[PDB]
Subunit: 322 residues, 3 copies
């Protein structure tokens, strides 16, 4: 009967259309390179005021080379003119009543205890320690550099998909609305401008610059390179997203210690101990490209052929039985 | 004959069970994301004694920011109060008999030779050089900071599988036996505590802290995120492993040079040249996730269907022929 | 007819040979690990002359630890003995006629303006600023360190394919023609020597050391680990390639700022501000391994079986119809 082939032809049309659209949607004919090879060069610009001092890129940016991870110092605690010696620790956790509880068994991971119980102040009595004296007092409150909100981060990113040897950069003057020197990234108005405003990055991550600068934190500038290398070079485009990575028992924030080492004319050594709170920026470059390939196209082909060949039988059984 | 379908039914049961278990074991129905996107923040804690000096995190940890690669300095060689000028190199390799063998053709990659053969000491005669004087003597023996064995490394790791947009952290208070502030990673007792004892890490890597601290080395704290995103969020868990990466013509160990730059009141410049031996720690975050997908499930389906369809024919040929 | 099976047998021979060679060429029977896990330790060696000063590894290499990204400083601009205060900016862009155009609304991202229009020189009048004085003059011309062309970069690379747990290093004494201590990488004569001549790396990247050292730049030492883990351990070999990553509205080159901080005996602080131009080196380790696997071999098998089964029908239709 001719209707039998009109029923079968309809079966193949519909079923083959479902399978076809499904496989075509997932790019099942494409080999994928998900091992992007990226280089990141960052440049921070701005100047701020902290106490009655002016901080420039050489003062608050660390490291200086413009790597993918850098830190903008927003608040800091200074302990000036430290020198090796003995002194009573100012941390209450080191409180003692006699030299019998200042032995090596107490606070094993802490500082070096001399074994004497000494009077830090009239209200506290702590174990004496050998090290940089006086000791740090990290419980005071200090200001934060507010101008850091207006600083700019310029990200030059040069990536390459090695499976296809397709390398490209994120400096695209044609895609930017304004000049590169004066543009400013906006997710909607200028989403390809490589210049980001620090405060902007803090907002895109859903963070308050006040609390963040106060406690420090870790933000991620995410560069995504999802690309169809079957299309034009013009179509492989970077997409920027933003997130706070420290998020959140453990106290939030981000700080690290470093000293400025000075020596006296008579030769003795003394340092300035600095506890730095700031916003660390991690440039995270993800990317995956898809290029047409014979092997995945054949495997997907056989898959759709056989799958349709079974679906038509099952649909005949469902129809005829009814 | 009915037995013919009892033989065929048994064929399909057994063969289909083999194929089924095989494909089900390898998660052939899952798409895999092997491009984890990780952020690492490290914090070292401890104090040590070197010579008659006390080293704190600002003295022996480099860099300070808490990156994925950092160095704990265990032994160092100091050459104090260097100043630009001319002096005889102390390296024997520069030995000379006359100014005729101190020309630019000799040791091209080394220091800057003035062209004079001078007497470093009464027992050695070396080419004179222009640079920081006096020169370094890196053949002496110096102590090592033993307290570094008791230092602690705290690793906060925040990763994300982008193909699925599944981001998670390694601070899991529910999985840890003790409090986060006081716990300590143990592969068996507390395998999710992010706090590692330096000496412990040295042991897990099969290394002697004495020799390692003496010669320096490169260890890797490996964080693995193998995850089945079909299961609960609770099931995606990090697993820590440890290894020595420098391992091993070339002399083992790890050291690097840096100077502390001082200036005189009259304005002349002089530095302290430091050769640092320590244990570099590389946080290596691997991970791959698997999520059920329609395309791989269909491809695997067709594969098992056809493969069974052929296996039953071959098994009929093997049975009937016998 | 017997010829019918001689036509079919020829069909299967030829078609099955095409399909077979195609699938065998692309390693369709292999699972692939494209998430290499690499560790990079770099060591720079050399000494140069800048002005009448000698620069050693502690002077021009930054950072010092030997990471995968480091900078060899070739030219620099010094601004000595800066001190916090007020002074007229030397940048023409800050030119003013009266204190009415030195308000906060002007150059928002720049330095801190006091609000006064002052005379930097007799030929220029600029806004006064608070910060490190005097200000930097980055428009002068300075020399470049030419000896940096003869410096050597030693790259120790230790990688691991985790899906197969196959870890290996790039120090291969058997593969090198010369001793490791004295060899020197040559793409043809010694392509496995880990010691690279800086000038050589500049040439392999198609760059002129004069212009590059003058303006600075970003080069990539690419280490590729394409491996067939079905073959011998001896066959997994690294291949080195080279490229300039900054390439290229924006001014080319690479520079960054850092200061040397000194303090006076009376306690006042003053720094030496340094603008550094050099060649940043990014070690980029790519790699992907392929190991025989049952699942991909079965999927590829079914694919070739069905594809041939259809190709023979189509070829019968093409032949018989003719
Ligand atoms: C580590 O600390 C313990 C105290 O908890 C102490 O007994 C031990 O001697 C320390 N180890 C070293 C190497 O100092
Ligand atoms: C950039 O713009 C010019 C217009 O003058 C155009 O010819 C060129 O193709 C553009 N490049 C890309 C990558 O679109
Ligand atoms: C160096 O001088 C300072 C004060 O000028 C003094 O505190 C210190 O003890 C001196 N160093 C030595 C080793 O005497
Ligand atoms: C590099 O060293 C060789 C000696 O091996 C020397 O002849 C040459 O001039 C050096 N190159 C530069 C740029 O100084
Ligand atoms: C953590 O512990 C609480 C117990 O109060 C539990 O309700 C919560 O689900 C746990 N979180 C995870 C991720 O297991
Ligand atoms: C600075 O003084 C030191 C000794 O105080 C001396 O060695 C040096 O030559 C002086 N510098 C100059 C340029 O005279
Ligand atoms: C940022 O700059 C603008 C001028 O463009 C200024 O009005 C604003 O106050 C600045 N923001 C901060 C936090 O100083
Ligand atoms: C290195 O060389 C020795 C020759 O003495 C050889 O036995 C060994 O197998 C070689 N190693 C590799 C990895 O080829
Ligand atoms: C410290 O001395 C220098 C000159 O020796 C002077 O310029 C500066 O004003 C002094 N500092 C203070 C706070 O007086
Ligand atoms: Mg404290
Ligand atoms: Mg030496
Ligand atoms: Mg300027
Ligand atoms: Na298939």
């Amino acid at each position: 009967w001719t209707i039998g082939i009109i029923n079968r032809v309809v079966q193949l049309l519909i079923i083959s259309y479902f399978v076809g659209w499904v496989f075509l949607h997932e790019k099942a004919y494409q080999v994928r390179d998900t091992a992007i090879e990226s280089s990141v060069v960052t440049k921070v610009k701005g100047s701020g005021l902290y106490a009655n001092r002016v901080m420039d890129v050489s003062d608050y940016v660390t490291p200086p080379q413009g790597t993918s991870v850098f830190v903008i110092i927003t608040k800091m605690i200074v302990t000036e003119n430290q020198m090796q010696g003995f002194c009573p620790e100012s941390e209450e956790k080191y409180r003692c009543v006699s030299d019998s509880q200042c032995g090596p068994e107490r606070l094993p991971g802490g500082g070096i205890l001399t074994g004497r119980c000494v009077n830090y102040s009239s209200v506290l009595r702590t174990c004496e320690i050998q090290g940089w004296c006086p000791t740090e007092v990290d419980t005071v409150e200090t200001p934060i550099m507010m101008e850091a909100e207006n600083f700019t981060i310029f990200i030059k990113n040069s990536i390459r998909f090695p499976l296809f040897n397709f390398e490209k950069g994120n400096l695209l003057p044609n895609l930017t609305a304004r000049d590169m020197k004066t543009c400013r990234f906006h997710p909607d108005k200028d989403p390809f401008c490589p210049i980001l405003r620090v405060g902007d990055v803090v907002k895109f991550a859903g963070q308050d610059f006040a609390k963040l600068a106060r406690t420090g934190g870790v933000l991620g500038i995410k560069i995504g390179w999802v690309c169809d290398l079957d299309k034009a070079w013009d179509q492989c485009i970077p997409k920027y997203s933003f997130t706070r990575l420290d998020s959140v028992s453990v106290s939030p924030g981000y700080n690290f210690r470093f000293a400025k080492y000075y020596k006296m004319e008579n030769g003795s050594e003394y340092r300035t101990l600095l506890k730095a709170f700031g916003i660390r920026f991690d440039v995270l470059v993800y990317g995956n490209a898809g290029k047409f390939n014979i092997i995945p196209t054949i495997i997907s082909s056989v898959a759709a052929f056989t799958s349709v060949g079974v679906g038509t039988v099952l649909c005949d059984i469902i129809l005829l039985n009814f």
